[PDB]
Amino acid sequence: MKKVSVIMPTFNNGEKLHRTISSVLNQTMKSTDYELIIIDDHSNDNGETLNVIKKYKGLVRFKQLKKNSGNASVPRNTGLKMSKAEYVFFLDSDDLLHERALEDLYNYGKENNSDLIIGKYGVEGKVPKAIFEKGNVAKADIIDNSIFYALSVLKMFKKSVIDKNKIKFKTFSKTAEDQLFTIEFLMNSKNYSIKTDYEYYIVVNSTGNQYFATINEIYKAIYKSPIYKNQEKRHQLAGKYTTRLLRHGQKKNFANSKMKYEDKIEWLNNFSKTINKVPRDSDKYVTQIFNLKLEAIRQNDLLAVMIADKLL
């Protein structure tokens, strides 16, 4: 059993993919203990991506899907089925791992019996920060360590948790599926760790029917948590997630935007129906400045949302 499967979907990456693959093959961890699983989502760049990948034959595992899925969910699920490692780590094909990433995160996880290890993110070009503000955290808390503000899957996940709970990337929506994966993982596991000694992971830079179906699933995951079983704790998590959704949600400022009227109505209708399945008991945990915006959304009142945004 390997310590870590790095799962990396590709699509039309081309020559830039050398630096990514190279960052993974040059880990401090012994290559006996990890594998890179590359799942190409049927690239169509006259062979250029597949040609880069072929230079690493024998050093990687590779699968190409027959038809392009059009998002990382199907390739990520494929990678999950192929991995038999203790932990998985999702890498986006533009990005880079620090040479110490797999070894440092695995070791910290092993030491602290971690279900999830989050490595500090860096950037190339012009990522969450609050989660990393306290340095290393051996046993982090969702609310105190701002985990709802860092829900990417660019993290080290314990595979047994995924297997036992049959956690998979959903395909019904094109967006927020990663967030849902991470939420379902958090709600079905206990021990999360945050590791900060280096920048371990370097990021290289709709009507809402699908998106709000996915948000609906996030709230469902919280309220059915077998880890957080207390109803008041579920209200608290749900309320803190609402706060995050209002601060950083997709199209958060739709109301006063240049969106067509009928689109704004359909968006808000979806947002309203979703939030009205969330108990009002969660509302007291939402930050006070958002009181009017949240109520506007509950009432499905576009003018009130517009006004709420003007006053924020």
Residue list, annotated binding site for UDP-N-acetyl-alpha-D-glucosamine: 9, 41, 68, 76, 92-94
**Long-range contacts (CB closer than 8 Å, 24 or more residues apart) made by 158-162:** 158/86, 158/87, 158/109, 158/114, 158/115, 158/116, 158/189, 159/5, 159/83, 159/84, 159/85, 159/86, 159/87, 159/88, 160/86, 161/115, 161/185, 161/188, 161/189, 162/80, 162/88
Has 115 been annotated as catalytic?
no
- 268 lines the binding site for a second copy (CB under 8 A): no
d(CA 312, CA 211) in angstroms, rounded, equals 24
Q: What SS3 class is residue 90?
A: strand
240 touches which of Mg ion, a second copy, Cl ion, none (CB within 5 to 8 A by kind)?
Cl ion
- Phi and psi at 293, nearest 5°, equal -55, -45
H/E element, 194:
strand 192-195
248 touches which of Mg ion, a second copy, Cl ion, none (CB within 5 to 8 A by kind)?
Cl ion
Q: How many residues bind a second copy (CB under 8 A)?
A: 21
* Interaction residues for Cl ion, span 116-135 (CB under 5 A): 128
Residue 294 CB, nearest approach to Mg ion (Å): 14
> How far is residue 86 from each of residues 26, 110, 161, measured CA to CA in Å?
20, 10, 10
Residues annotated within a binding site for Mn(2+):
94
* Interaction residues for a second copy, span 206-265 (CB under 8 A): 256, 258, 260-262
* Interaction residues for Cl ion, span 138-177 (CB under 5 A): 141-143, 148-150, 152
Stretch that binds Mg ion, among 52-60, 209-217, 275-283, 303-311 (CB under 5 A): 303-311
d(CA 96, CA 149) in angstroms, rounded, equals 21
Stretch that binds a second copy, among 8-16, 138-146, 160-168, 280-288 (CB under 8 A): 280-288
d(CA 10, CA 14) in angstroms, rounded, equals 9
Please identify which residue in 32, 46, 226, 303 interacts with a second copy, judged by CB under 8 A: 303
- By beta-carbon proximity to Cl ion, the closer residue of 75 and 208 is 208
Identified catalytic residue from 178, 283, 301, 309: 178
List residues with catalytic annotation. Answer: 178
Q: Which residues bind a second copy (CB under 8 A)?
A: 256, 258, 260-262, 280, 283-284, 291-292, 295-296, 299, 301-304, 306-307, 310-311
